[PDB]
């Protein structure tokens, strides 16, 4: 889906997916119940904000919604909502994830490493298990993919739903994510087979400002490979 990464004090422009009626905006944070921010009018274009929310914080116009003064607590998942024309229910279209930090120096690309199956696991269960792990990446936005012989295999693969944190009790701490691919032992014993673990990472854009010395954490694909061993 869409991933947005901004710095404290900057602005973030949120896009809405579902395409009549009243459009609602919800905010979901980890460990916290999803709440409503505001809702906007199609006809009168009147904007109504909830209780406790100061005006000028969220801008809404025909569908995009703009955030103005960002802080670290603006992080979390933003949904756009509407009620059905016929049945009564609330539909959420958006998959948008937003993360905000004091400095963009906290942003790092992932380090991808592929590990070869054990001779013990081949001899015992007669199945080879390949594991890939992406380490030291911030923010949380990453997509891992397994590729065999130029094609992506969704079969026999397992990836951790929630990436573990490397430094506990830390807000800006980098993360780590592991994924596994299990194939037949006979498949791994064939050297003609190419196993590639590709991790897509979404970093800072071209319009973002990078003051620091190291390489700019732009959106990139970090990959690692492995080959089959017969003996």
């Amino acid at each position: 889906t869409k991933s947005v990464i901004r710095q404290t004090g900057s602005s973030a422009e949120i896009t809405c997916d579902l395409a009549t009626g009243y459009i609602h905006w919800y905010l979901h944070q980890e460990g916290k119940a999803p709440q409503r921010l505001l809702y906007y009018d199609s006809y009168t274009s009147s904007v109504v904000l909830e209780s406790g929310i100061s005006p000028g914080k969220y801008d809404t116009y025909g569908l995009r919604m703009i955030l103005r003064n960002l802080i670290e607590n603006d992080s979390g998942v933003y949904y756009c909502a509407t009620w059905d024309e016929k049945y009564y229910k609330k539909l959420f279209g958006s998959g948008t994830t937003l993360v905000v930090t004091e400095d963009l120096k906290n942003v790092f690309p992932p380090e991808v490493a592929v590990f070869e199956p054990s001779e013990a696991e081949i001899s015992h269960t007669q199945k080879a298990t390949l594991v890939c792990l992406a380490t030291g990446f911030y923010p949380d936005h990453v997509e891992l993919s397994w590729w065999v012989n130029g094609k992506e295999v969704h079969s026999g693969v397992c990836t951790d739903p929630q990436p573990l944190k490397e430094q506990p009790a830390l807000n800006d701490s980098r993360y780590a994510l592991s994924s596994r691919l299990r194939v037949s032992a006979t498949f791994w014993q064939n050297p003609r087979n190419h196993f590639r673990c590709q991790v897509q990472f979404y970093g800072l854009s071209e319009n973002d400002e990078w003051t620091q010395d190291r390489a700019k954490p732009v959106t990139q694909i970090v990959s690692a490979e492995a080959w089959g061993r017969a003996d």
């Binding site: 015992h124 792990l133 026999g156 739903p161 592991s178």
Partner: protein, 197 residues
């Protein structure tokens, strides 16, 4: 918390039933309770609706036992399957004085995470040592669904994950652990009695 879900995380085997508890607080005579399913892709999907005045709602394998007296609304997934694994949210719509004029807020609970446990036919739990291809990790796999993998005191220990062989019709549980290191001493806790480690 207006709406309340006591259950943080629930774990139940496949082809079984799981009941997700939800309670609400409202002063209104007429209202609506909703149940949503949040995917790891962060997509909120509608499941079933329960009205203030309605019979107990049943849609597919999703059934809810409604108690108006105790303000309890409980979602029950009848026949569990692997795809059913997600975080479920209980939501309560409250009407304006005149109606439900499409302005209505839906109050969400913190959600209940549901982890379905795959069926292990012939488990043989073992810890394997995997060497890096590039230079110089330990996985605990093929273990029964009942045993849960716990993070070591530290050492990075991953939570368990379900792997499905489509061609071999084979399903297994796998958990990996590593640090910058013995495999047997890697897991401080979580303890099967059969180990090839």
């Amino acid at each position: 918390q207006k709406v309340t879900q006591a259950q943080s995380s629930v774990s139940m085997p496949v082809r079984k039933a799981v009941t997700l508890n939800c309670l609400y607080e409202t002063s209104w005579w007429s209202y609506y309770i909703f149940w949503y399913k949040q995917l790891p892709s962060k997509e909120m999907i509608f499941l079933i609706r329960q009205g203030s005045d309605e019979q107990n709602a049943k849609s597919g394998r999703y059934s809810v036992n409604f108690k108006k007296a105790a303000k309890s609304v409980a979602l029950t997934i009848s026949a569990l399957q692997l795809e059913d694994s997600a975080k479920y949210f209980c939501a309560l719509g409250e009407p304006s004085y005149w109606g439900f004029p499409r302005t209505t807020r839906v109050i969400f609970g913190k959600g209940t995470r549901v982890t379905v446990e795959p069926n292990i036919q012939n488990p043989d739990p073992a810890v394997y040592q995997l060497r890096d291809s590039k230079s110089s990790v330990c996985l605990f796999t093929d273990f029964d669904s009942q045993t849960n993998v716990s993070q070591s005191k530290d050492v990075y220990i991953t939570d368990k994950c379900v792997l499905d062989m489509r061609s071999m019709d084979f399903k297994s549980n796998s958990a990996v652990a590593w640090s910058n290191f013995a495999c047997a001493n890697a897991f401080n806790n979580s303890i099967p009695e059969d180990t090839f480690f």
